[PDB]
Amino acid sequence: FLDGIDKAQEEHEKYHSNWRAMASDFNLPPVVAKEIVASCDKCQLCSPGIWQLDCTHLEGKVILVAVHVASGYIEAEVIPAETGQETAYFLLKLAGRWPVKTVHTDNGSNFTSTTVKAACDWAGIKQEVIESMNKELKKIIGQVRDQAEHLKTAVQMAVFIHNKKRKGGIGGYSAGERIVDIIATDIQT
Amino acid sequence: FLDGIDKAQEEHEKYHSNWRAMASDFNLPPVVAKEIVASCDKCQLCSPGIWQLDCTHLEGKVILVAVHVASGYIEAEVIPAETGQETAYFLLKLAGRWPVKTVHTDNGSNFTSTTVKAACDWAGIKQEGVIESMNKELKKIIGQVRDQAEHLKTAVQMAVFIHNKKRKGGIGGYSAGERIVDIIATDIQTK
Ligand SMILES: [K+]
Ligand SMILES: [K+]
Ligand SMILES: [Zn+2]
Ligand SMILES: [Zn+2]
């Protein structure tokens, strides 16, 4: 397995995967996988149509985060300002991407604006986890901020890592694999 | 299904859904759904990891388009400038939500820039008419809905919505968005 050690180290240097991930992906003894994490300075050892939206802030920038409740898959974007126009545009992209039937926000004046109500009307979305998810997202951003000049890039690096490089559960899937399985199954029924 | 006729007709004013989608979505006989389209003045009756990318232009603005070859699924955005930075950011966003293993593109200034190559290396993507046909259909759909939006930005996402969700066909009567989810889900089962 000695060849896999350099591969796992490059994997962790980009995505900061945990030791179970590296042990399984690169056929490493757990003792070796844990040493990669311990050596790293940045680390230590529902219905399918429901989404949650919230705005969080980092480095004086607004990050719009959507979470597929049933899977944990997230989409996020740095927006120029916390406005309903930016939220409506965001919802319209998401809605053409996945089956978005219901969206849960706080009563933020961006989520209650008429521009957003107009967007949900057009896209056929009803309006009516995310906090624990902003925490996890900001954690990943911190691990990778050094790899990006601008925050917007780090944010998208973090989303990539959460959806694809953070596996778990009975199936051992990532959140990206889960949402695809959940929606694909919902089609068949 | 007689009550569904007014609902489908109302939705077609908005999405301009093809007849297969209205028949499926509203439980209308094909012959009824076909009439709705005929009445409309604006209408008329490989590995899962492979994507194509190109820029197309409309109203003096730049639209970056990504096509999932195996399914016909599309993502598209109006970008502020044909630059490697904006293309790389688009690339990083796409790879976070789908399995992007290979991206076919032109050898132009933008898609061969070092910034785009940096994004591909970080995300595990390797670089290497379908895009032309999707460009003309997307531009065609944007034409049908352009009056519903102030800015081209919104009309583009409306067109992407319509193309992925409201244009069904084939054996299962799937949309392009249902086909990509089905194709990727099947790839997971095999792997
Ligand atoms: K450590
Ligand atoms: K017609
Ligand atoms: Zn680390
Ligand atoms: Zn029409």
Numbering used by the authors:
A (entry chain B): 1 to 45, 56 to 138, 150 to 210
B (entry chain A): 1 to 45, 56 to 138, 149 to 211
Q: What does the primary publication say about this deposited structure?
A:
Integrase (IN), the retroviral enzyme that catalyzes integration, is produced by proteolysis of the viral Gag-Pol polyprotein precursor by the virus-encoded protease. HIV-1 IN is comprised of three domains: the N-terminal (NTD), catalytic core (CCD), and C-terminal (CTD) domains. The NTD adopts a zinc finger fold containing a conserved HHCC motif essential for activity. The CCD contains a D,D-35-E motif which binds divalent metal ions within an RNase H-like fold that comprises the active site.
To investigate structural differences between IN 1F and IN GSH, we created an IN 1FNTD–CCD construct containing the same solubility-enhancing substitutions (W131D, F139D, and F185K) used to determine the structure of IN GSHNTD–CCD. Four copies of both the NTD and the CCD were present in the asymmetric unit, with the inter-domain linker (residues 47–55) unresolved in the electron density. Each copy of the NTD folds into a 3-helix motif coordinating a Zn2+ ion with residues H12, H16, C40, and C43. A potassium ion is coordinated by the carbonyl oxygens of V37, A38, C40, C43. The ɑ1 helix in chains A and C begins as a hydrogen-bonded turn at the backbone carbonyl of F1, while in chains B and D, a canonical alpha helix begins at the backbone carbonyl of F1. In IN GSH, the ɑ1 helix does not begin until D3 due to a shift in the L2 side chain by ~ 10 Å, accompanied by a ~ 4.6 Å displacement of the peptide backbone at L2. In IN GSH, the N-terminal amino group is oriented toward the C-terminal end of the ɑ2 helix, whereas in IN 1F, it is flipped ~ 180° and oriented toward the ɑ3 helix of a neighboring NTD. The overall structure of IN 1FNTD–CCD is highly similar to IN GSHNTD–CCD (global RMSD: 0.90 Å). In the IN 1FNTD–CCD structure, the unresolved 10-residue linker would be long enough to span the unobstructed distance of 28.7–31.8 Å to position the NTDs in a “proximal” position. Despite the remainder of the structure showing little to no difference, this change in the N-terminus is sufficient to improve concerted integration activity.
